[PDB]
Amino acid sequence: QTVASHVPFADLCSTLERIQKSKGRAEKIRHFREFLDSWRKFHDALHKNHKDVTDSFYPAMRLILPQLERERMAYGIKETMLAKLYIELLNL
DNA sequence: GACTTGTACTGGAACTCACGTGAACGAATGTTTTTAG
Numbered sequence: 515q516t517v518a519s520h521v522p523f524a525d526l527c528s529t530l531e532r533i534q535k536s537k538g539r540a541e542k543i544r545h546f547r548e549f550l551d552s553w554r555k556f557h558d559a560l561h562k563n564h565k566d567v568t569d570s571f572y573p574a575m576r577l578i579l580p581q582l583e584r585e586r587m588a589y590g591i592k593e594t595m596l597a598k599l600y601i602e603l604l605n606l
Numbered sequence: 607g608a609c610t611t612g613t614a615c616t617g618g619a620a621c622t623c624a625c626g627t628g629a630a631c632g633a634a635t636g637t638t639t640t641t642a643g
Contacts, residue, residue, distance in 0.1 A: 537614090538615090539614085
């Protein structure tokens with residue numbers, strides 16, 4: 515029962531947007547700490563009858579720090595390819 | 607990982623203000639000593 519299955523991507527996107535918008539490092543750290551605390555509290559409340567489940571913050575941590583992603587190889591779609599694919603798919 | 611550039615935060619020093627302490631000069635007054643009439 516992974517926590518990421520119950521956490522919408524919109525919440526993470528909003529947290530990242532708030533972090534970027536904030537000017538002082540204190541506000542960014544506060545936002546990230548609030549998100550992490552909510553995630554940890556939800557994880558603790560979900561896995562009550564647990565057996566040392568291998569569920570952690572990796573699903574969100576990898577997205578927050580894509581540069582450290584080693585499990586997944588190169589996507590093969592760079593900025594030019596992404597722009598092209600957006601053009602065909604959206605039928606612009 | 608080491609260097610460079612750029613941005614943000616922050617505690618200490620500079621400045622000012624105000625007061626207290628001590629030292630020096632001159633004004634005004636009072637008082638004492640000495641000397642010419």
